Each structure stands twice: as C-alpha cells, then as structure tokens.
C-alpha cells in the first residue's frame, strides 16, 4: 500500500510515534518518504546480502528474519514479510526498538542525510491530525 503524506502521519500518530524518543512526527514522515516513498511493499538488497523491508526499510541482519541472511539476529522477532503489510503496526513496533538502540534516528541513512536538521514540520503541514 502506498500511503498519502497525511494519511501516514495520522496512522503513525495513532501508533504513538509522535515525539517517541523526542522525535517529532515530521521526522518519521520524512524518513518514510525518503526510505520507501510511502510504499509498504518496498524492499532493497544490500551488498552484504541483507535486505531492507517496508515503509521504514528495516534491515534483515538485525531486526527481522527473512530466512536468507546468515547471522541475522531477529531483534523484533518477526518474519521480514510482516514489515510489508498495509497495516503498519509491525513496522512501527520494530522502529521503536531500533530508534531506542542508542543511535536514535541516525540508524536510518536517508533520515540522517535528507531529514536531519531540515524543517521537518513541513511534512505534516496542512494535515488534519
């Protein structure tokens, strides 16, 4: 499912992401935009053989099991396919663990390079929240 900007913002808020670990909602919407372009079915293979899944592009080496990443840790205890659902609950619950990992949102390369330090408020601008 390809979310619309404001539809995603509202779903993430309902799921408790607004200000989770101090990151405003605009940060999470910006991250999703640049990570998957609001597409829940997005996947990308990395050179180390791992794969990034879903709306927030969560990696198989540490967070989910895809049955094809040797040494994977599966910290969120879910099959990576669950991260591609139209229902973003699993993606959100796993993201809460990642962001709490000590590195904050820097864990997401597109957030660090394209969202960090920018006017993230624009991402929820105009939405009925």
Is residue 119 annotated as involved in ligand binding?
A: no
Relative to beta strand 51-53, strand 58-59 is antiparallel
Q: At what angle do helices 5-14 and 25-36 cross, to 10 degrees?
A: 130
| Rounded Cα–Cα distance for residues 116 and 114 (Å) | 6
| 8 Å CB contact between 91 and 10 | no
| Rounded Cα–Cα distance for residues 16 and 24 (Å) | 11
Identify the three-state secondary structure at position 92.
helix
Catalytic residues: 35, 52
| Rounded Cα–Cα distance for residues 44 and 123 (Å) | 24
CB-count burial class (<10 Å; 0-12, 13-18, 19+) for 97: middle
| Rounded Cα–Cα distance for residues 25 and 13 (Å) | 7
Question: What resolution does the deposited structure have, in angstroms?
Answer: 1.9
Class of domain 1-129: mainly alpha
Residue whose structure tokens are 């993230």? 120
Experimental method: X-ray
């Amino acid at each position: 499912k390809v979310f619309g900007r404001c539809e995603l913002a509202a779903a993430m808020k309902r799921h408790g992401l607004d200000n989770y670990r101090g990151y405003s909602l605009g940060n999470w919407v910006c991250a999703a935009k640049f990570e998957s372009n609001f597409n829940t079915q997005a996947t990308n293979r990395n050179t180390d053989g791992s794969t990034d899944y879903g709306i927030l592009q969560i990696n198989s080496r540490w967070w989910c099991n895809d049955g094809r990443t040797p040494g994977s840790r599966n910290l969120c205890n879910i099959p990576c396919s669950a991260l591609l659902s139209s229902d973003i609950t699993a993606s959100v619950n796993c993201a809460k663990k990642m962001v709490s990992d000590g590195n904050g949102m820097n864990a997401w390369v597109a957030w660090r390079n394209r969202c960090k330090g920018t006017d993230v408020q624009a991402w929820i601008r105009g939405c009925r929240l």
